[PDB]
Amino acid sequence: LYFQGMHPTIARMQEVVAKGDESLIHALLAEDVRFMPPTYYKTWTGRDPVAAVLGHVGQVFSEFRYRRIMGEGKDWALEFQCKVGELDAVGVDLITLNEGGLIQDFEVVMRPYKTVGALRDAMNARVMTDARFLKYREALS
Amino acid sequence: LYFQGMHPTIARMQEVVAKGDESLIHALLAEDVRFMPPTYYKTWTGRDPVAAVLGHVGQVFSEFRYRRIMGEGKDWALEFQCKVGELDAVGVDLITLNEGGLIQDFEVVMRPYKTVGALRDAMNARVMTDARFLKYREALS
Helix, strand or coil: CCCCCCCHHHHHHHHHHCCCCHHHHHCCEEEEEEEECCCCCCCEECHHHHHHHHHHHHHHCEEEEEEEEEEECCEEEEEEEEEECCEEEEEEEEEEECCCCCEEEEEEEEECHHHHHHHHHHHHHHHHHCCCHHHHHHHEC | CCCCCCCHHHHHHHHHHCCCCHHHHHCCEEEEEEEECCCCCCCEECHHHHHHHHHHHHHHCEEEEEEEEEEECCEEEEEEEEEECCEEEEEEEEEEECCCCCEEEEEEEEECHHHHHHHHHHHHHHHHHCCCHHHHHHHEC
């Protein structure tokens, strides 16, 4: 009916990425998924480290909601609005799905500059504190 | 054929926004178009000031090209890659078209943080220097 053009992974991602539930995020990611954050021009590779990073991003954000879900087949752009503390933010999750329907590339773009700076500072604190990231450091390139 | 789902304004925008030709940008914008940059959490309103701002953004960027054109009807996300000097950038032009097919809302999200900072600095210099912006200041809110 109205949702014929919606890919199931994209539908499932909306309900899970918002909440930042790491266990639920893991199942949607390709084994060698590439996550590119809005902060650094780097790439986190692997479902285990990427799910952990996304869990932390979800924790930092408040008042999170998607606004527009745009795309078809394997190429999607999920527009969202949220806050980082008292600062407003708008962003897009750029998703590329593989043949198996799992998230292969997940690239995040955002606005405004000041809120991205606040996100970067919050994420530096979380990643450094989370002792599991001693192992996950190797996944960043 | 392959382009049945493409809106004409979106096709025309690709060939014109890249070049930063202000005169060609003007014709695609609604009279009361709202432009939201990736730098400040503000809005430029009006086809004259918005076309001028977009002309300057096009001038700052180098090696500009769209990667993916995603959407349908009035809702579009145009993913691009470019450089600001030697710094790499990826972004999305979030476009909302009106009933008449003109660009009503144009919101830009980008990555990485450092390149957006470089864009902000370059744009502060251009806008301040361009004497037409004495009149256009009133269009920023």
